[PDB]
């Protein structure tokens, strides 16, 4: 064989190639560097008002404001530091599973098991908020979308793709393909130049936005991948899994650097976030907890226990002033 | 200590706290029914009949069904079913025409979830008019050795739907409803009225503790 | 977005008339209304408020007790019913529209007006002109002052800028501090601080001469400023 033994040989040496040039591990460079301490964080407010599962979640970036949507079609916009409704909007799917917030903070994203990525307009001269456009054409569930500004966004699909969209025309400008199970998260870098996410296939990737070609894959995984976050600095990621585990990639390296797992942990995690200075890794378990994970040490330094069902998603202002925890018990929870 | 603007702005999520809380009302008295079942499995032929994701909204007798297919998802990977807790019941179909292996291996993954061990099963074998020409082919064994009952309709099919029963793992906490009389008549949905009637009649006993 | 008032005419002392006010091209429900006045060339003063729902109505001590403000969502109306007329109350009424949420902008959009003739504590703002000459392409500095310290503990600072063109109802400039309406030049700016506050336009255009008027939110009655004329 000549195809089938190039694959193998390549992927072989490559692989190697990269175990011998490893140096070491995150946890054994900075040995020598002191923890975190417990991180014990009380619920300041509580987000009453969705009354099914919340499914995700997106701080705005003024810090102040918060958009979630739940199983029960409806994506409420908080006022985080009164605990003020802003906004309700009536989804036009129950079944929504992604929320984004823009940048700019004029419009807002959500979509689902219907296929579609529905943008929702905020600032109109109507004093309500309105449908600004429905990008069409993934196959497969939707599991992830975020603004790159306010006419481009990034989405993840069920069908083994992603998609670069222009939200003016209506059109996938980009298809990113090569994943061979459902694309489960993706998380936009900060300078909205490249993206990385995870599938049901057990494997990460790092995509360019602008070329459209796969820059590179990561694996080194035995489960799914249900969540994915940048670095703040974009330099790195980590993954959550049906594994039980968590596994922090470098997009330099090639390689996994770190692995965030506990044996008392048999569950998986269902969302991942960085605090603003990435040194405490926050994941939502099935365990009805979350759990403060030290970056750098791997231990876990806290628990916002509190909520009794499923953590479902996460987030971190981008002051990094406070948490925002929502779960299936149908509330959402403030930490600082 | 509130300023003249944030008296109006709590008055505005007050409203909209009354809002969310009637809009939920509404959506709480509404039948949620997930429906599931292989391919060429009538489906397609019972959201026809009944009364990405499609969602089929129907009123009977003053009881308002939201029935979710979600058969368009070419990903067998499960990672949406547990969005489906809730649901009063799934209604799963099989077709009597190794298909029927699958059949079985599909009614015992739903049956085995821990997301759907409290919501009933209404299993469907709706048409009655092409079930019984093609059984005297050949009787039930050329992927099912086990089967040494009369070749008939009624035995084979009563046969049949032991079987499917018998994958019931855990018979204390849901219940299985089984349909057999002819798709052509107009019983599918009063079945299913019937179902759900028993299912939530059951619920809120097991929540009195009269259970 | 349009706002229409009607109901306005003659009236002799100790009778009653309706004011009222359509609208349309907006959510008219999720909007707070306010009536406003004001009298031959002698400035704005307000008169009352309801809130989206009418669990709040506001009435100017002016008038409180006398006057009454009601709302009609479903026909998208607002009515003023005045009960008695002095000759006090002869001025031209404006309809206001105004939406209370994080970041939003209450007095937006003003109405046309409409005229009513009658036969024969409180903040108080300050505006240190009434006419300022000036000629196109140089830069003027409106100013205002105020009794107390308009910036709340929420960090806001409860003055508007309202500027009334010619002959055309009054048009909302800023509505916090700086903070620039929608479709007003970027050349508008806003600043100050607790008390004194200033309205600086650069390259000044022939549209931006009338009457520049700071009024105040932090506290009820709403009380606006004599109204400082810009010269050309």
């Known amino acids: 064989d000549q195809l089938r033994q190039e694959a193998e040989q390549l992927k072989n040496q490559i692989r190697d190639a990269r175990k011998a040039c490893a140096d070491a591990t995150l946890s054994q460079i900075t040995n020598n560097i002191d923890p975190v301490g417990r991180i014990q964080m009380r619920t300041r407010r509580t987000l009453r008002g969705h009354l099914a599962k919340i499914y995700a979640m997106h701080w705005g970036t003024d810090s102040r404001l918060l958009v979630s949507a739940s199983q029960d079609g409806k994506l409420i916009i908080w006022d985080s530091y009164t605990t003020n409704k802003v906004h309700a909007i009536p989804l036009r799917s129950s079944w929504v599973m992604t929320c984004a917030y823009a940048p700019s903070g004029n419009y807002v994203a959500c979509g689902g098991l219907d296929n579609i990525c529905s943008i929702y307009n905020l600032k109109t001269r109507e004093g309500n908020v309105r449908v600004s456009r429905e990008l069409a054409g993934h196959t497969g569930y939707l599991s992830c979308c975020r603004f790159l500004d306010d006419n481009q966004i990034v989405t993840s699909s069920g069908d083994t793709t992603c998609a670069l969209w222009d939200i003016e025309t209506g059109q996938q400008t980009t298809t990113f393909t090569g994943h061979t199970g459902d694309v489960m998260s993706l998380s936009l870098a900060p300078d909205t130049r490249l993206f990385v996410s995870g599938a049901c296939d057990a494997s990460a990737k790092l995509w360019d936005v602008r070329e459209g070609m796969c820059r590179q894959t990561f694996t080194g995984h035995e489960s799914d991948i249900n969540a994915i976050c940048f670095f703040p600095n974009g330099n790195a990621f980590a993954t959550g899994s049906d594994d039980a585990t968590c596994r922090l990639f470098d997009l330099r390296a090639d390689q996994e650097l770190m692995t965030y797992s506990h044996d008392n942990i048999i569950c998986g995690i269902t969302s991942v976030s960085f605090s603003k200075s990435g040194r405490l890794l926050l994941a939502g378990y099935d365990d009805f907890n979350c759990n403060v994970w030290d970056a750098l040490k791997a231990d876990r330094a806290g628990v916002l226990a509190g909520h009794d069902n499923r953590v479902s998603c996460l987030g971190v202002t981008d002051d990094g002033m406070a948490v925002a925890t929502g779960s299936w018990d149908s509330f959402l929870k403030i930490w600082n | 200590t509130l300023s003249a603007e944030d008296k109006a702005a709590v008055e505005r999520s007050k409203m909209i706290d009354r809002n969310l809380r009637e809009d939920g009302e509404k959506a709480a008295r509404e039948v949620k029914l997930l429906l599931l079942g292989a391919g060429e499995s009538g489906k397609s032929t019972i959201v026809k009949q009944m009364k990405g994701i499609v969602e089929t909204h129907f009123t009977f007798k003053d009881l308002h069904f939201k029935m979710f297919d979600v058969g368009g998802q070419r990903s067998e990977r499960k990672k949406w079913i547990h969005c489906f807790e809730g649901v009063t019941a799934i209604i799963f179909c099989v077709a009597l025409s190794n298909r029927m292996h699958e059949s079985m291996k599909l009614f015992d993954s739903i049956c085995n979830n821990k997301w759907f061990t409290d919501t009933s099963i209404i299993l469907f074998l709706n048409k009655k008019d092409l079930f019984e020409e093609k059984i005297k082919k050949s009787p039930l064994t050329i992927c099912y050795p086990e089967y040494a009952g009369s070749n008939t309709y009624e035995e084979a099919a009563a046969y049949i739907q032991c079987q499917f029963e018998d994958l019931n793992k855990r018979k204390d906490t849901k219940e299985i409803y089984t349909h057999f009389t002819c798709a052509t008549d107009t019983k599918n949905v009063q079945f299913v009225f019937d179902a759900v009637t028993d299912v939530i009649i059951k619920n809120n006993l097991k929540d009195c503790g009269l259970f | 977005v349009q706002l229409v008032e009607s109901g306005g005419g003659l009236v002799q002392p100790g009778g009653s008339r309706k004011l009222s006010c359509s609208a349309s091209?907006?959510?008219?429900?999720?909007?707070?209304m306010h009536w406003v006045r004001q009298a031959p060339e002698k400035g704005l003063e307000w008169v009352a408020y309801i809130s989206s729902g009418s669990g709040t109505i506001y009435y100017a001590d002016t008038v409180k007790g006398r006057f009454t403000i009601s709302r009609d969502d479903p026909k998208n109306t607002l009515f003023l019913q005045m009960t008695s007329l002095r000759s006090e109350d002869t001025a031209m009424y404006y309809c206001?529209?105004?939406?209370?949420?994080?970041?939003?902008?209450?007095?937006?959009?003003w109405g046309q007006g409409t005229t009513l003739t009658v036969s024969s504590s409180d903040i108080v703002m300050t505006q240190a002109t009434s006419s300022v000459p000036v000629t196109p392409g140089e830069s003027v500095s409106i100013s205002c002052r105020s009794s107390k310290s308009l910036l709340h503990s929420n960090g806001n600072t409860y003055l508007y800028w309202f500027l009334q063109r010619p002959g055309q109802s009054p048009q909302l400039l800023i509505y916090?501090?700086?903070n620039l309406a929608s479709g007003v030049p970027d050349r508008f700016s806003g600043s100050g601080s607790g008390t004194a506050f200033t309205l600086t336009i650069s390259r000044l255009e022939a549209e931006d001469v009338g009457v520049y008027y700071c009024m105040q939110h932090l506290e009820y009655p709403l009380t606006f400023g004599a109204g400082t004329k810009l010269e050309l």
């Open positions: 091209g907006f959510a008219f429900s999720s909007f707070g």
């Open positions: 206001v529209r105004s939406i209370y949420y994080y970041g939003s902008s209450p007095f937006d959009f």
């Open positions: 916090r501090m700086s």
